[PDB]
Amino acid sequence: TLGNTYLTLADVQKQKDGKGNVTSEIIEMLAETNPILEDMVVMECNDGTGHLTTIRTGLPQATWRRLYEGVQPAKSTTRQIKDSTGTLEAWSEVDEKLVKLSKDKQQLMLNEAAAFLEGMNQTMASTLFYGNTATDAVKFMGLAPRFNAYRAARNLKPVDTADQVIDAGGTGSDLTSIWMVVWGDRTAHGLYPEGTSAGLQREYLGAETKELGDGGVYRVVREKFEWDLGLTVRDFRYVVRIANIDVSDLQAGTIDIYALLRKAYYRLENRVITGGRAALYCNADVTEAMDAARLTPMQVDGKEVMMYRGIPVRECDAILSTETAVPSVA
Amino acid sequence: MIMDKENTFSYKQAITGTAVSTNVIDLGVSRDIGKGVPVPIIIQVVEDFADATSLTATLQTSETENFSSATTLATSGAVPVADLTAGKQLAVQYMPLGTQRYLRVNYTVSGTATAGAVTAGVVMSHQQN
Amino acid sequence: MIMDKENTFSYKQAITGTAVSTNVIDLGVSRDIGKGVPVPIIIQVVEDFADATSLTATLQTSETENFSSATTLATSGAVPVADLTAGKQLAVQYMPLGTQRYLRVNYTVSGTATAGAVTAGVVMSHQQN
Amino acid sequence: DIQTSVAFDRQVGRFPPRAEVVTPSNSEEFTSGVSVFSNDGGDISVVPLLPYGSAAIVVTVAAGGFVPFMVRKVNATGTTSTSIVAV
Numbered sequence: 001t002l003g004n005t006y007l008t009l010a011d012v013q014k015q016k017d018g019k020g021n022v023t024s025e026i027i028e029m030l031a032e033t034n035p036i037l038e039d040m041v042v043m044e045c046n047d048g049t050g051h052l053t054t055i056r057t058g059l060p061q062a063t064w065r066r067l068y069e070g071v072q073p074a075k076s077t078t079r080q081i082k083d084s085t086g087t088l089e090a091w092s093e094v095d096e097k098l099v100k101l102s103k104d105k106q107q108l109m110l111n112e113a114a115a116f117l118e119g120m121n122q123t124m125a126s127t128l129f130y131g132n133t134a135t136d137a138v139k140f141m142g143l144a145p146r147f148n149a150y151r152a153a154r155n156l157k158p159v160d161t162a163d164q165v166i167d168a169g170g171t172g173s174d175l176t177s178i179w180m181v182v183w184g185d186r187t188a189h190g191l192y193p194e195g196t197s198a199g200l201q202r203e204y205l206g207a208e209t210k211e212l213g214d215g216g217v218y219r220v221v222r223e224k225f226e227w228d229l230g231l232t233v234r235d236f237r238y239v240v241r242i243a244n245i246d247v248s249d250l251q252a253g254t255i256d257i258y259a260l261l262r263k264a265y266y267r268l269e270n271r272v273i274t275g276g277r278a279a280l281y282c283n284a285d286v287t288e289a290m291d292a293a294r295l296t297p298m299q300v301d302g303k304e305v306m307m308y309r310g311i312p313v314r315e316c317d318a319i320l321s322t323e324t325a326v327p328s329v330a
Numbered sequence: 331m332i333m334d335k336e337n338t339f340s341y342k343q344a345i346t347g348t349a350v351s352t353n354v355i356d357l358g359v360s361r362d363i364g365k366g367v368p369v370p371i372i373i374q375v376v377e378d379f380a381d382a383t384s385l386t387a388t389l390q391t392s393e394t395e396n397f398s399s400a401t402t403l404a405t406s407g408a409v410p411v412a413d414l415t416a417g418k419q420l421a422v423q424y425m426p427l428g429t430q431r432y433l434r435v436n437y438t439v440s441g442t443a444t445a446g447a448v449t450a451g452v453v454m455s456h457q458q459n
Numbered sequence: 460m461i462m463d464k465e466n467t468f469s470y471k472q473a474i475t476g477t478a479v480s481t482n483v484i485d486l487g488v489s490r491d492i493g494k495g496v497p498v499p500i501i502i503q504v505v506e507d508f509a510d511a512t513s514l515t516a517t518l519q520t521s522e523t524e525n526f527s528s529a530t531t532l533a534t535s536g537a538v539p540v541a542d543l544t545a546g547k548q549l550a551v552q553y554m555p556l557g558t559q560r561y562l563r564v565n566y567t568v569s570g571t572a573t574a575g576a577v578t579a580g581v582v583m584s585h586q587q588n
Numbered sequence: 589d590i591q592t593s594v595a596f597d598r599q600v601g602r603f604p605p606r607a608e609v610v611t612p613s614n615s616e617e618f619t620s621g622v623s624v625f626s627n628d629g630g631d632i633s634v635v636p637l638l639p640y641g642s643a644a645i646v647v648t649v650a651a652g653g654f655v656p657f658m659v660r661k662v663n664a665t666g667t668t669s670t671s672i673v674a675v
Binding site for chain 3: 052053057078079080081
């Protein structure tokens with residue numbers, strides 16, 4: 001006894017109007033901006049079943065020759081990692097007579113497609129950050145669950161994921177985190193599998209005929225939306241997480257973000273990648289806490305972009321600020 | 331991962347007690363599918379276990395809907411509850427060899443449990459690190 | 460089976476009496492194998508056996524060169540005497556997950572046989588049929 | 589009283605604008621780091637700010653005097669003063 005399942009006359013009456021037909025200007029009131037989706041690169045899954053990756057793991061030991069002395073041959077042992085992917089789809093349903101009843105069909109589907117696009121962007125950003133294969137096996141693993149641990153004292157050289165996570169100290173149900181990532185072919189990028197195209201794939205399935213439990217066939221117009229996307233952490237030494245940032249102590253003057261940021265930059269790897277964009281991924285609370293006044297922004301066409309030590313600070317609305325406490329691998 | 335509905339043994343099944351799998355994958359012909367090109371599988375534990383003690387996770391295969399006489403193709407052993415967290419795999423990577431007619435997963439538990447779930451089933455490609 | 464020396468656990472090693480693999484693999488650093496691309500291995504009996512009750516070929520790994528910290532990556536189980544026949548693949552088709560610096564093969568036989576041999580190692584392409 | 593003509597500044601130093609009388613409690617935390625001074629002197633057991641598991645220190649501050657090491661929590665048990673005021 002409801003009216004929210006499929007699109008009804010009320011919705012088209014409320015969107016398609018203006019003393020006429022459908023509007024080409026539907027304002028996205030729920031449009032959480034996630035510039036992670038724009039900075040992140042994509043790459044076709046050439047391998048075929050799970051994006052593969054070869055990482056150097058051992059290094060040969062060169063030698064100095066002493067008056068015609070032999071140099072033993074050297075190996076170079078290599079590790080290899082597989083990055084599975086995941087797919088999201090969606091389906092529009094409008095009664096064909098309803099679509100025809102509105103003066104326009106292309107626009108009344110275009111705005112409904114923009115709605116689905118925004119929804120997919122939001123869900124994909126959320127799962128890109130907090131996407132876990134541990135609990136949702138149908139979800140490609142995001143940035144967080146690959147780092148839900150930390151070493152007490154960092155190793156001399158990065159040899160584990162836990163060696164790239166800084167424990168900011170904290171507890172409760174108000175902690176947050178910060179991500180410093182470099183987006184690159186050899187660092188990290190999106191993955192659209194083979195055959196499947198890159199990014200969102202709007203598909204307009206013309207007009208079709210439906211059914212019910214008792215005949216009742218009626219004509220519906222169905223728009224199929226799909227987006228496949230996998231996440232790969234190449235050279236994970238390019239990703240550092242600052243976990244357990246208590247937002248309560250952050251709003252007050254108990255912890256300073258600049259110390260955490262400098263520690264993270266210390267724990268990052270020096271940018272040498274060519275063509276690789278890099279950025280900071282921190283929620284609005286962090287940049288609010290950046291109200292501490294020489295670290296300064298930088299000239300890019302005079303834009304609302306902080307440039308912490310030559311690194312853009314992209315504030316992402318998807319970074320939820322009530323994470324779970326990150327344990328320590330003692 | 332793109333793990334799908336049909337060839338999937340259990341979806342978030344609690345098996346808190348000493349239960350067995352629900353979706354018994356049945357094949358009319360003894361293909362013994364592991365041969366040749368591999369097929370990835372998971373018995374990854376999907377949500378933590380609270381008060382169990384062992385989770386023997388046999389991969390029993392038999393020749394009848396009801397497993398009157400079953401055959402083991404992969405057993406995890408008496409895994410203590412201290413490891414039954416999320417992502418704790420309980421068998422080999424790819425499909426084993428010897429899947430005669432039917433396939434169901436056993437979940438012999440030493441004592442009962444108040445929490446625990448698994449997602450055993452076939453996966454197109456594994457997820458690692 | 461395209462076997463290879465310098466990556467072979469044991470070439471034509473005799474099994475009689477409890478013993479380990481003659482050759483212990485050493486992967487430079489403690490990095491991983493089973494993950495990513497599958498790596499086929501065959502701990503397979505080559506020559507037939509005798510009065511020995513069973514056999515327990517396990518794939519033990521350890522960080523140290525000498526194995527004082529045993530870690531079972533995969534176990535053959537207590538295979539009975541009858542099935543100790545030539546061509547019996549006693550362990551998993553592919554390399555299990557979690558390879559440390561070194562790996563060994565441990566043969567634990569219930570009793571001692573007058574016959575028995577095993578050729579274990581990693582092959583380029585595990586040959587079925 | 590009123591200010592008309594500014595001079596050199598950012599060096600005069602000033603007292604913290606905030607203030608409130610503290611009711612000591614064994615289980616009650618302060619949202620931000622606060623400084624407490626006893627109006628009548630006596631023993632005061634408190635919690636420092638940075639070390640998240642700091643146990644307690646008795647300060648035995650004189651009357652009107654200030655307790656150093658800006659305080660996270662003022663414990664009722666171990667406090668002899670009766671006129672604690674935060675700032």
